[PDB]
Design a binder for this molecule. Structure first.
Ligand SMILES: N#C[C@@H]1N[C@@H](CF)[C@H]1c1ccc(-c2c(F)cc(Cl)cc2F)cc1
Ligand SMILES: N#C[C@@H]1N[C@@H](CF)[C@H]1c1ccc(-c2c(F)cc(Cl)cc2F)cc1
Ligand SMILES: C=C(NCc1c(COP(=O)(O)O)cnc(C)c1O)C(=O)O
Ligand SMILES: C=C(NCc1c(COP(=O)(O)O)cnc(C)c1O)C(=O)O
Ligand SMILES: [Cs+]
Ligand SMILES: [Cs+]
Lengths: 248, 399, 404, 249
């Protein structure tokens, strides 16, 4: 019927706010600590948890996240560790999706990974290096196992491809990126009513507030990794400030 | 040709080799380059400029030479060397670069970036950007800037900026990563001049098309010089540009064996190699679905080879299609084997080859023993070894 | 067919008179092996089987014909003249030297010699000799000046990989002229089994003629290529001049064209007035040196003045006798080009055309730029790009601040 | 008429001995010391003195003489210093010929140098890098100024060139070089009566007497330079040993 994250953005609509989407990579600084930090995000006011799968060649990731996934892989993080983190978030009451590059999914098996992600309580998959043109396997698995599929749009996206990408998305659309962020969100709002998340290197409460004026969800990742590196209390306080900014 | 992918860049239907496994942020410029290539490949103005440069500037055609002094070392077979080592800049890379450099100019781009491993593609790219007045930036792994330092200075003299990549394995795999990040940011005015037959559509097809001239020349030259088509055509395979270029004219000749030789480093059983087909498995890497060295979770295994040009854990998708169809066999060649063929070609024929190309000769020697006396084997001599003289002199104790 | 005999010297090797340029200023101990080479060359120069064996290696092994590229982006710095580069830099081993080595190595096999010795300054002739000796199964020993083994070290290693023995000459100026003196000593002692593969259009008869005849192909090809691309004979043909092989090679086909200027450009080092140069025709006088009577740099007593140049291939205080004859007859003009002028041309060719020339060839490119200004808009100038600059990359990088 | 060195070999052959021909380069260690040493050679029994003109690129000179010629040149030796050496030898009663590469002669002027050499009392000119094929100017100046012309023959010389070289020589023929030496002298004395000198790297009386059996003159060069490096007393001693060797009875 509806998307899995559909009810989440509705609850944010009634409360006159946007959703806080928090990214953390599995296994940084280690698997027990990362899962402890991800649970802290739920207790600190994160609406959606992006659980990242550390990849050996992350082309789309900035330096804060890239060096954190390199350390997780040096520590020996496995893909099964991410599914173990989803189950932990779901037990703690949180709502988790998985952001991964596509080759780990191919190695696992697209259908098998979707099945195991759903059984852990996962709600969807964010695919930064998979465009709809190659997602035939993923579309079938997304329907079979009732998982949302979050594709990325870009400021450079041609009108034809933007409409094709939105038409192929369930849950919300990742608007990855001046006036570039709201203008891109407006082009998505003009072809569909699907929620739009915005990732813009958010660092402060003021920045998260400026984004919530036009986006249905605010995506924070690098700033959470930087906080977790200083300490787990710093992440708790920073997540709190981010939880307040989305309600303005 | 009948061996082209579909509109989405897929080889072979259900298998799905190739395609475009890239972020949406690159789709606007990737479709832009695709349309520009489809338009200019049938433009006589563009074809006349490419032929004019290949003839009067690059030095084409490259000759075909029968290395008769190698015959006794190849089981009395007849080794024919396709002399790509004689091209301007000194390797096959100039063929692909002259096509894409002219295309960048046709598209209104003002900046050209490129990766490089052995430095040959970097030097060729820097060469064409100097010729056409383009801004050039070359990404090169920090390890490769050390063991191929000659080509770094050639690039700098040609007016190109060189950026040493220190992340990852600091080799060809990581130069490509950073050059991809550069393109994501500067796609409005930057053309990515890709150096091998890999990457997302249209690059595997386009690179092969600009390298087809090698095999087309070879197929005419072997018949004139030997009176018949060869018994086998062999080349070395890093990403696959020089191998696919010499193979393509022979795909539909049923009696011509096609053998690609890949770097095996210290041996495939050692985990210090780059033998993608021998030890890899299907996966998506650097924009295409192909074979690559990957662990149980799908993380890219870092490759190692004495040759910087073959030190790459992936391989072009059309080769994966040719391997699946059984049209081409792919075999490993170790560092020791390649260096023996290196010294042998120096002492027998007075040709100092690239260590990349030395892999093909080493494989050719073994294939000559297999096919026997009188067998005709055409070998793509992909480049000369001025960049490798210091490496080789240390290998043979000449310092 | 073969090649005519209109500009050749007499039976004694003299240009322009029985006591003029060239000849044989050699000791009697060498005259047996010199006559043996003269007889062998006279016999094989008219043998179709020999010319076939040579053309076969030149086409399939060395990559001839070399192209003729119009460097359009050089026109601005040449008074809007049209520069045509004869791309000898694309030959196997990277220079014109391979043309002469292939002929002489084939000849050394026809004579039954088993040992080949050669001299080298820039390393290009040394590499080409070791290349042919590896190809034809001959033992090879190369003589090189110790100062040149340092500034052309890339070629020293190439020769060793090809199986040759490199000997660093420590006498004299430790450059080209002293390598030749040591190779001469080797030939006197081993005249019986050894062939001397001389690498330039100088020395005693028959070497000025034989080297020129093996480089004639450059001018033969260029004369055809330039008429097909520019629609007419050029206004001038230019080349750098060390010993003189690459110049005489591209010059010869044009000698009988009265409208074609011929300009050779010699190394002027720091300057002809500074005493640190190699401008043999500018600052030299006639004398007997290295087996021939020609021009050389010499003090008032007759002692050879040591030469200097940033290019090891032009660091030679003498010149071939046929150039002396052409200079006296007024057929060819010879002009100096300094280190700084050459290196400007070197960097310009890199920036504008993507060709990294040999520093020797950069002297010719610099001369062409100046000549273009004199002739002006539309003039057609053919330049012999004698070699590539892979050997000079470290020298050029220091010059342009890409090191430190 | 007869050659200038004719009477010298006539007297030696009448004394059942060979002529001792000594080489020293002008200006080693310096000009005054070298003239002192050439005079010492005359005093110590040297029948003919080969005054050497140091050349910048001497291809025929061995290592001992090469080092000495470089040192003389660094000291500023001139060609005019070689003519002064001949005057000094003529004054001391000796007999001087000049050995030189051809280019310093060309730079001086062939006729001019021949005139000035004979005026200084010189008797001939040894030309190691001048073959008769290129010696037209030298043949004319040699007949004019009554100077001997000593050309070289080698063990590799063809019968044609050997006969032509011996025909072209006056005074004596230099046989530059094992049994290769006496076999070469036999080829010269098969076609002519001209005296033959033998350079063989002689360094002792035993080798000097060994050559005097078949040669008309014994040529010593390197051993005299090595002796002069040790000092004039050593040079006189060595020359005395060699003067005894060239005699047989
Ligand atoms: N997302 C993502 C990925 N990290 C790697 C893939 F797994 C990184 C990547 C993506 C694209 C490429 C690429 C290339 F190699 C050549 C060309 Cl011409 C164009 C490209 F876009 C390279 C690496
Ligand atoms: N005597 C005497 C001279 N010392 C130098 C001249 F001044 C030395 C010499 C004589 C001859 C040559 C020569 C050469 F250069 C090339 C060839 Cl192929 C053959 C040669 F014989 C070289 C140096
Ligand atoms: C990596 C590049 N070279 C690879 C290479 C190869 C292998 O690349 P292919 O794309 O597989 O042909 C073969 N031969 C030579 C001389 C090479 O330089 C480069 O120069 O950047
Ligand atoms: C001296 C040799 N080379 C001289 C040279 C020259 C001058 O040589 P000529 O004989 O004057 O043509 C020109 N160009 C190149 C590329 C050269 O290498 C040598 O390497 O032995
Ligand atoms: Cs590979
Ligand atoms: Cs010169």
């Amino acid at each position: 019927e509806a998307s899995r994250l559909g009810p989440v953005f509705d609850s944010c609509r009634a409360n006159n706010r946007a959703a806080l989407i928090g990214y953390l990579p599995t296994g940084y600084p280690d698997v027990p600590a990362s899962v402890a930090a991800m649970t802290a995000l739920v207790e600190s006011g994160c609406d959606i948890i992006e659980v990242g799968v550390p990849y050996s060649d992350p082309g789309m990731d900035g330096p804060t996240i890239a060096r954190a996934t390199e350390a997780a892989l040096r520590g020996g993080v496995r893909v099964r560790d991410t599914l173990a983190a989803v189950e932990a978030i779901s037990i703690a009451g949180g709502r988790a999706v998985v952001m991964t590059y596509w080759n780990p999914v191919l190695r696992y098996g697209v259908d098998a990974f979707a099945r195991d992600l759903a059984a852990a309580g996962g709600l969807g998959l964010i695919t930064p290096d998979l465009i709809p043109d190659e997602a035939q396997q993923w579309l079938a698995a997304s329907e079979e196992h009732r998982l949302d599929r979050i594709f990325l749009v870009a400021p450079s996206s041609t009108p034809e491809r933007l409409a094709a990408t939105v038409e192929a998305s369930r849950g919300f659309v990742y608007a990855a990126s001046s006036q570039a962020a709201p203008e891109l969100v407006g082009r998505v709002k003009a072809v569909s009513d699907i929620p739009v998340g915005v990732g813009l290197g958010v660092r402060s409460r003021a920045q998260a507030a400026q984004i919530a004026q036009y986006a249905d969800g605010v995506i924070v990742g690098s700033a959470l990794v930087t906080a977790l590196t200083e300490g787990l209390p710093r992440l708790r306080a920073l997540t709190g400030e981010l939880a307040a900014g989305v309600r303005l | 040709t009948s061996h082209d992918p579909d509109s989405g860049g897929h080889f072979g239907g259900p298998s799905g080799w190739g395609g475009r496994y890239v972020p949406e942020a690159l789709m606007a410029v990737i479709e832009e380059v695709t349309a520009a290539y489809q338009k200019e490949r049938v433009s006589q103005d563009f074809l006349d400029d490419l032929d004019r440069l290949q003839a009067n500037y690059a030095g084409r055609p490259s000759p075909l030479y029968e290395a008769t002094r190698l015959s006794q070392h190849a089981g009395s077979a007849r080794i024919f060397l396709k002399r790509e080592d004689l091209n301007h800049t000194g390797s096959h890379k100039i063929n692909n670069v002259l096509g894409q450099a002219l295309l960048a100019r046709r598209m209104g781009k003002t900046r050209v970036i490129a990766e490089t491993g052995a430095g040959q593609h970097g030097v060729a790219t820097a060469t064409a950007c100097a010729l056409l007045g383009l801004d050039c930036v070359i990404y090169m792994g920090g390890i490769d800037t050390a063991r191929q330092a000659l080509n770094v200075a050639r690039m700098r003299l040609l007016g190109a900026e060189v950026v040493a990549v220190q992340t990852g394995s600091k080799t060809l795999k990581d130069a490509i990563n950073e050059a991809f990040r550069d393109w994501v940011a500067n796609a409005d005015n930057t053309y990515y001049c890709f150096g091998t037959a890999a990457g997302p559509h249209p690059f595997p097809t386009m690179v092969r098309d600009f390298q087809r001239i090698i095999g087309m020349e070879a197929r005419v030259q072997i018949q004139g010089q030997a009176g018949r088509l060869p018994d086998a055509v062999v080349a070395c395979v890093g990403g696959g540009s020089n191998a696919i270029g010499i193979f393509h004219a022979f795909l539909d000749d049923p009696g011509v064996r096609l053998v690609g030789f890949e770097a095996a480093g210290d041996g495939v059983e050692t985990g210090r190699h780059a033998a993608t087909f021998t030890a890899g498995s299907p996966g998506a890497f650097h924009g295409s679905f192909s074979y690559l060295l990957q662990d149980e979770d799908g993380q890219t295994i870092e490759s190692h080879s004495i040759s910087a040009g073959l030190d790459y854990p992936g391989v072009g998708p059309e080769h994966a299609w040719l391997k699946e169809a059984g049209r081409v066999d792919y075999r490993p060649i170790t560092d020791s084997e390649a260096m023996d063929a290196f010294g042998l070609l120096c002492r027998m024929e007075g040709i100092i080859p690239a260590i990349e190309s030395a892999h093909a000769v080493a494989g050719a020697l073994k294939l000559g023993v297999e096919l026997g006396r009188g067998a005709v084997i055409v070998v793509n001599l992909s480049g000369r070894g001025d960049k490798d003289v210091e490496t080789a002199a240390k290998w043979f104790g000449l310092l």
